[PDB]
């Protein structure tokens, strides 16, 4: 893609005030002004720790180079005990939100349409979004990779305007490579990213397709980030476990070099 | 109940930094030392606003009289994007957590067993819990109130030790009468509260049954709180909409005048 390389660190349900202070300081320290010009860096933080991370970044020399993202959001205010609304994120000056992550689609049964509604409400409120898509092991075995991803994308596109895509980062999760014993190769990852690019080109426009960053959201570590970054349609990463270690995350952020 | 009157204000999915600052200050202002001796006051806050509420309370004269509770919590750390686990609440010094609220049991399909699991890990971590139970309209007309409530309670008891019950406050939600058009009378509420007490007495012990506070968690407001507070087994309230108004909330807190 033609978009600026973007690396997000999804901390998932991990962290303590102490570990997060060390991590946040390490992440900010790794992205100075010069590097920030070539890579957008985002950290996905558990709701309760967002204020702490914001506080830490405020005191860091490179704090402005690290953007805070929530890991989910709800779209209805009122009688929904336990949920954090999109509006609360905006109220708290959180610029990003990760939506439709495979863990929420599977464990919390978020459907294509429910994810699309979240994306729609989030963007309408001004949030930028990392929208997660991807097929399961069963779906890939059934050779439904393209059909499944297309359906996920269509649900999202049907809900928003062409202009709304300007805030969207897509993250491809090869769910079929998650605890299955099957690892996605750069070639396999690129094959799906290429088709996502094609889907956007066919249904929206070539311009939107090329402008939209498609992050690879499979297993990313310091040992495979460069090989993956070499792929034409991988415009960044949504890192899992490795994002909890500032040193590992640093190596991944720097793999943007493969694009220069 | 022989337990201390306890009033929880479940803010659910509502609030902004501005509205919460005004509300928190109003709630704290409404509970001085003398009233605090009669009523334990808890506020259920959206995850992202917990730090703010904590900060506000620390700066108010009566701040120590108001306890902060989360509105939900996940079982543990790990690959659960969007979730906040019990350990994070303890790490942030949050003393309470509301679990099994009807909105989560119905909307997010939390089963009796799943809720029980959460209660168990919450208490293991050191949290105090407001565990919600209650039957639907379909279950009530089918005359299954006792069996349904018994099953919800059994799931919880099966997962924890006798001593773990010290940390538990039960909240009965007459789901069949919350915004349905049906009004739960004080007599109807007392009847279910009595049976909850009876269930604990036969399934655990009379000591635990009497020590465990049973809050009424149906629709509570300034107009109906006193008649409910007069009931022998209504040891407090878990207030919904009315908790977003300091004046209405303190009116409800003061219904403890029916106890003394």
UniProtKB/Swiss-Prot annotation, chains A, B:
Listed Pfam families: TIM
GO MF assignments: triose-phosphate isomerase activity
Entry EC no(s): 5.3.1.1
InterPro entries: Aldolase_TIM, TIM_sf, TrioseP_Isoase_bac/euk, Triosephosphate_isomerase, Triosephosphate_isomerase_AS
GO biological process, one term: glycolytic process
Top-rank taxon: Eukaryota
Keyword Isomerase: yes
Top EC class for this record: isomerase
UniProt family annotation: Belongs to the triosephosphate isomerase family.
Subunit organization: Homodimer.
Protein name as annotated: Triosephosphate isomerase
Gene name of the record: TPI
